Design an enzyme around this catalytic site. Structure first.
Site: not given
Ligand SMILES: [Cl-]
Ligand code: NA
Length: 129
Positions: A35, A46, A48, A50, A52, A59
């Site tokens: 990650e 991301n 969408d 959002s 991380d 998120n």
């Protein structure tokens, strides 16, 4: 902060992640490796909209507030910036909520794709834990 492998293992263990929801310490270290590469300051946008955040790439759509993710929630009740701290307490607290949400560690797609089913114990090899 860029954690050493065993350094992170020790911190995660202290914060009660070892065997949390049945997931051994190696699973958590593996997840963090893929990650964030053990970097607490890691951020990734991301598709969408959002983002991380942190060691476990938590998120903003559901878990933390960053003020720029439309229609999103803040279920860990924290600013997303708090997930970037050298102290992993907030990230661990929030990860415990995430892994309890129904799908276990599948919530981390990198865990599913790169850690799940593998020899995750390798991630704690050599560590005095
Ligand atoms: Cl599970
Ligand atoms: Na949010």
């Amino acid at each position: 902060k860029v954690f050493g492998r065993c350094e992170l293992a020790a911190a995660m263990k202290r914060h009660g992640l070892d065997n949390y929801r049945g997931y051994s310490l190696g699973n958590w270290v593996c997840a963090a490796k893929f990650e964030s590469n053990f970097n607490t300051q890691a951020t990734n946008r991301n598709t969408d909209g959002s983002t991380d955040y942190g060691i476990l790439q938590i998120n903003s759509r559901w878990w933390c507030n960053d003020g720029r993710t439309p229609g999103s929630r803040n279920l860990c009740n924290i600013p997303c910036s708090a997930l970037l701290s050298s102290d992993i307490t907030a990230s661990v607290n929030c990860a415990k909520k995430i892994v309890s949400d129904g799908n276990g560690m599948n919530a981390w797609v990198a865990w599913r794709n790169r850690c799940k089913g593998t020899d995750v114990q390798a991630w704690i090899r050599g560590c005095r834990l």
